[PDB]
From Swiss-Prot, chains A, B:
Record text on subunit structure and interactions: A dimer in solution, but in its membrane environment, it exists primarily as a mixture of dimers and tetramers and spans the membrane asymmetrically. Component of the ankyrin-1 complex in the erythrocyte, composed of ANK1, RHCE, RHAG, SLC4A1, EPB42, GYPA, GYPB and AQP1. Interacts with STOM; this interaction positively regulates SLC4A1 activity. Interacts with GYPA; a GYPA monomer is bound at each end of the SLC4A1 dimer forming a heterotetramer. Three SLC4A1 dimers (Band 3-I, Band 3-II and Band 3-III) participates in the ankyrin-1 complex. (Microbial infection) Interacts (via N-terminus) with P.falciparum (isolate K1) aldolase FBPA; the interaction inhibits FBPA catalytic activity.
Result for mutant: residue 198 to S: In PN(a) antigen
PTM text: N-glycosylated.
Molecular-function annotations in GO: ankyrin binding; bicarbonate transmembrane transporter activity; chloride transmembrane transporter activity; chloride:bicarbonate antiporter activity; hemoglobin binding; monoatomic anion transmembrane transporter activity; protein homodimerization activity; protein-membrane adaptor activity
Site, Important for anion-proton cotransport: residue positions: 313
Organism expressing this protein natively: Homo sapiens (Human)
Region named Involved in anion transport: 191-262
Impact noted for substituting residue 150 to C: In SPH4; Dresden
Effect of residue 366 to R: In CHC; Hurstpierpont; induces abnormal cations sodium and potassium fluxes; decreases anion chloride transport
Full protein stretch here: 369 to 891 of 911
Protein name: Band 3 anion transport protein
Intramembrane region residues: 464-494
Renumbered residue ranges of the record's region (Microbial infection) 5ABC region: 352-386
Length: 516, 516
């Protein structure tokens, strides 16, 4: 009955994952039929787009425009549409992440030094990723996800949610750095590619738009589970909380004529960036020069790292999204979701388009957007394939809707990314126990991990996860940021060796409960 | 036992009000001995000062600097110190208001037209106010305050609290009007008396500082009756909520070097503004020219209006402050508080210094600052004379502490005035019933005015007060703003004639309850 279990046959998991979810494919399509879903499409679109614009820029400037915005938008769309209509957990938002950006930057520096064609080099990384995932799905290597306890999920879920907030602020800090509050400004300033000199009222209006969008979003979330207005209208106005928050603040910026703000820049059309270097289809043997033999066999060793990055990235997100406390009746297919994400990424490499992973904050936010509330607890979750599809489609059609996106500020969306960061710490027992460090022992939740276990022991456990978070934060900040998945895997030994010595088995049953 | 009752003897109320409160004068002084009180002194100081700076400016520019900041600061201090050590309800904050400003502007225009000495003219207004209050206190004319039902108190309390918020925003709107968000600015701009041309980052930083101070104050108020940190520390950090909110935001502005913000401007020393025209002591018969006879008898007719303005201003504030739902054990003396406020104002006129009234928002905020909370409901109220004294003293010594006040922005204090406006709508059944218009009939407080009385009837009553508010708002906006007290008195006939026809006696007992 459980999804994580080793079957005798080869490709046994993939078969059982299909026969589980595909009978509900009609019901899935019809689960989209509600206003929450439309509000979820509109919300998660900007959550899906803005990274594909941001990382698209970061790839472009870094990798001499071999991978850019045009490539990443098309990649995120095609892989998003395929995964929405096939993937066993459609709530998983397939997009490009920080850990993947770091690899492309690292692999480019490696290709640049040795004297190799980068875009061609990636094709052979992809060829191994097609072999390595099919090898794992054959023997059901996703059975290792069984041993990823709440411990590892909570640390990852919290680490990523904290980093996502630190990301959102550093963008705002960069505006104040580029556009400082000076006494005097250069009045005649070009903004052809971007403001050259500092501008007046740009950094503060950015701070205003961010603070405003975050406020409206958080106050309309409060309004949803309030007791004001009819229950029919209240939930509709609440579900369209972020859509209204963006609409208000985009119009606030629209009526401000003279003062400048940074807005969503998309490509002219659907052209590969730097057409002089590469086309659409990347020739494995080489575009210009003869790509050598030793790399075509030694493309496994980078692909092995890329696999671990995506595998730990995607499958831990699947546990967090398809958690028993979240009312997920349809199910979750770990073998099939791994096959598509990594498989399509390997095929995407052939077209010089970035491989993607199930992004945690985007996926959790997508589930949280489609989760209902009553009385408070979860009744069901609106689990469809159309929200996953429409988001991917709109990210594909993003360039054709440049005139609409051109009027939307970034400072507005930074308010929404702050919301996505705050909101993602909802059902995280770790974060809940960080709050209980500051609460005195009189005011506690009255739940097994505080009642069964002593306050001294509970804070010691909570204390180790802070030590564990602190290590993982240092690992990212240091040059070895691609090793963070291997340091996150090392949290499982900790739970299954070190803690059982220091702690009793009765307490870990409650502290690190498989289900709340 | 009740304070509002007509005794046989002359000056009967004044005697009974003294014999009530003065036995607790030792206990009053010792009721100051707590951290809430220090936090209340610091909070209400800026609430007391900034109007005496603002109206001080408005008097100065209007009345050719005959009344100014120097006059109003000294007047607010001396009358504040005397009232703190004598006044039967020390929580009443004696200061200058909008209605009094409008009269001084109107009386100056009258004096200017006819050809009379204004500052001399006020002395004879004051001479009548000394006679007219002592005549009222003799016959116990404060017995008319008995008939001011919750109806009239709630409308006034809400009208004044709404106007105080509209006041706070219009100041912020004036900054954006004077310092607009333009593409280009004049770089070389003098600020000798004040910024001549528009400045960059002034209006938005003002909006930031206001939004920030309001946020910190409202979040530290939430923290006070939260369940985080020790109960000993939590209430102390909470009680010093506004002091911390100002300290944070004043330091935020301090570390911003180059960009300009408007700060608390106080006089050079203790010198009367426009010394050429007037001295300290105003000669009744005239300073320069012969002040005529007809005015010395016809100074009653303006003084009669000034009396009604202060009498309705002060005594309705006394009902709101000394309300039965607020745990006021010490008592409240309506006859003695009327005598001091109007009497000292009449004596203050002799020194060319403005007469004052018990200001509603400042008084309510002062009581709310000294009110404790448990579990939520009120246990007791820290009712002392030292908070009233220290505020008055600090407003007196404000000019000697110019270097401290010079670094404090106005935009910061606008955040605190927004807090004072929001916070003042706490125990107002009217405002509570405005919220119940938007709530559906399932989610209601379960209290006599919603349970005994039907929702149709309850919203009709709530509806009349909105019609009543709308009239009182139009009355202020129109030139006849000094008639608003007489239109507020007209709400008592409404309750005792019109409503008893349209409504049943059983419903008014609950809707318009003397006590909750
Ligand atoms: C419980 C939590 C508490 C914390 C809550 C904090 C929430 C954060 C909210 C942030 C504010 C969002 C609104 C931004 C508005 C910016 C307006 C602007 O820059 O336009 C200038 C506008 C833009 O129009 P313009 O540039 O065409 O101006 C042309 C003017 N002439 C021709 C004269 C040059 O310029 C003006 O100054 C026009 C004159 C009118 C003045 C307009 C200013 C309005 C400001 C009101 C703010 C109201 C909200 C404040 C709430 C804060 C406290 C809760
Ligand atoms: C509920 C949601 C709504 C709540 C709203 C509450 C209000 C929030 C804002 C309050 C804080 C205001 C800080 C003003 C910063 C002014 C800029 C400054 O320091 O000068 C730049 C200074 C200029 O001053 P300078 O001259 O001393 O600096 C040196 C200048 N250079 C570099 C050229 C040599 O420039 C910098 O050096 C950049 C440093 C980065 C500082 C940026 C701080 C950003 C503030 C973020 C606050 C978080 C709030 C986010 C909103 C959501 C709520 C969490
Ligand atoms: C676009 O691609 C071209 C072609 O590779 C890049 O040009 C190379 O990179 C830099 C020039 O910027 C030189 O060091 C190399 O010698 C160039 N080689 C070739 C084959 O031209 C260029 O960097 C890319 N431009 C961007 C940033 O889009
Ligand atoms: C001080 O007060 C005097 C008295 O009004 C002001 O001097 C007058 O200015 C008005 C215009 O506002 C003229 O109509 C009068 O003729 C002036 N009277 C005189 C000569 O005193 C003065 O403007 C005020 N300002 C100062 C100097 O402090
Ligand atoms: C482009 C950016 C700035 C904002 C875009 C958000 C737009 C598309 C959102 C914001 C509010 C939304 C509306 C909110 C409520 C409803 C009622 C529902 O019964 C039908 C959809 C409808 C009518 C929504 C349509 C989409 C909507 C207009
Ligand atoms: C996306 C691409 C690159 C993936 C390629 C992997 C191939 C080898 C996979 C994908 C789907 C798989 C099939 C899915 C289902 C079944 C039914 C089962 O009873 C026997 C195996 C069989 C027939 C699988 C064989 C292997 C298979 C064909
Ligand atoms: C339309 C919905 C369903 C899918 C969203 C993505 C669409 C718009 C994207 C994905 C890949 C894109 C194609 C990629 C490459 C090219 C070659 C170029 O020389 C012309 C445009 C063309 C032919 C693009 C057309 C639009 C396209 C099909
Ligand atoms: C991040 C680095 C610098 C610090 C490591 C995390 C800190 C915050 C952790 C590590 C050990 C923890 C302590 C371990 C045990 C106890 C006893 C308990 O009865 C109260 C909490 C208290 C006192 C914990 C507070 C938080 C703590 C101090
Ligand atoms: C800061 C400017 C704007 C106004 C002046 C406010 C000053 C005097 C306020 C702000 C914060 C206050 C402190 C806050 C908390 C405490 C703890 C309490 O157990 C003793 C008093 C003490 C130590 C306060 C002393 C006075 C204080 C320092
Ligand atoms: C701390 C409490 C008791 C007092 C607060 C207010 C004090 C400081 C103020 C109120 C009125 C003030 C006086 C008003 C008028 C004058 C005349 C002037 O030519 C010299 C200063 C002098 C003599 C002032 C001295 C200080 C004073 C007495
Ligand atoms: C804004 C100023 C100028 C006047 C407007 C007053 C409005 C808000 C008042 C006046 C009378 C009121 C109505 C009186 C009675 C009822 C019946 C009740 O079952 C539903 C609410 C309803 C329908 C009220 C809604 C609010 C109402 C319409």
């Amino acid at each position: 009955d459980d999804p994580l279990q080793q079957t005798g046959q080869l490709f046994g998991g993939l078969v059982r994952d299909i026969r589980r979810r595909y009978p509900y494919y009609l019901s899935d399509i019809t689960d989209a039929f509600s206003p929450q879903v439309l509000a979820a499409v509109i919300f998660i679109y900007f959550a899906a787009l803005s990274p594909a614009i941001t990382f698209g820029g970061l790839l472009g400037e870094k990798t001499r425009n071999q991978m850019g915005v045009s490539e990443l938008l098309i990649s995120t769309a095609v892989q998003g549409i395929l995964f929405a209509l096939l993937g066993a957990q459609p709530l998983l938002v397939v997009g490009f992440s920080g850990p993947l950006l770091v690899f492309e930057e690292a692999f480019f520096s490696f290709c640049e030094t040795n004297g190799l064609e980068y875009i061609v080099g990636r094709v052979w990384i992809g060829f191994w990723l097609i072999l390595l995932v099919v090898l794992v799905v054959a023997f059901e290597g996703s059975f290792l996800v069984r041993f990823i306890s709440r411990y590892t999920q909570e640390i990852f879920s919290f680490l990523i949610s904290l980093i996502f907030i630190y990301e959102t602020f550093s963008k705002l800090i960069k505006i104040f750095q580029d556009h400082p509050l000076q006494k005097t400004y250069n009045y005649n300033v070009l903004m052809v590619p971007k403001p050259q000199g500092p501008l007046p009222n740009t950094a503060l209006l950015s701070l205003v738009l961010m603070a405003g969008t975050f406020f409206f979003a958080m106050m309309l979330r409060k309004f949803k589970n309030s007791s004001y207005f009819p229950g029919k209208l209240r939930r509709v106005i609440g579900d369209f909380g972020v859509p209204i928050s963006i609409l208000i603040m985009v119009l606030v910026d629209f009526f401000i004529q003279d003062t400048y703000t940074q807005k969503l820049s998309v490509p002219d059309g659907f052209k590969v960036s730097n057409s002089s270097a590469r086309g659409w289809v990347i020739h494995p043997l080489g575009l210009r020069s003869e790509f050598p033999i030793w790399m075509m066999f030694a493309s496994a060793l980078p692909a092995l790292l890329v696999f671990i990055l995506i595998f730990l990235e995607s499958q831990i997100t699947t546990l967090i999204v398809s958690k028993p406390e979240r009312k997920m009746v349809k199910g979750s297919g770990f073998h099939l979701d791994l096959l598509l994400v990594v498989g399509m990424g390997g095929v995407a490499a052939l077209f010089g388009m970035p491989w993607l992973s199930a992004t945690t904050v985007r996926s959790v936010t997508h589930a949280n957007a489609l989760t209902v509330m009553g009385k408070a607890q979860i009744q069901e979750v609106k689990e469809q394939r159309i929200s996953g599809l429409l988001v991917a489609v709109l990210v594909g059609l993003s360039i054709l809707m440049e005139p609409i996106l051109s009027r939307i500020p970034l400072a507005v969306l930074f308010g929404i990314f702050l919301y996505m960061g705050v909101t993602s710490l909802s059902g995280i027992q770790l974060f809940d126990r960080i709050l209980l460090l500051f609460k005195p022992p009189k005011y506690h939740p009255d739940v097994p991990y505080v009642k069964r276990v002593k306050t001294w022991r509970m804070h010691l456990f909570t204390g180790i996860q802070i030590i564990c978070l602190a290590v993982l934060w240092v690992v990212k900040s240091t040059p070895a940021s691609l090793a963070l998945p291997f340091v996150l895997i090392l949290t499982v030994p900790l739970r299954r060796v070190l803690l059982p010595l220091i702690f009793r088995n009765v307490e870990l049953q409650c502290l690190d409960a498989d289900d709340a």
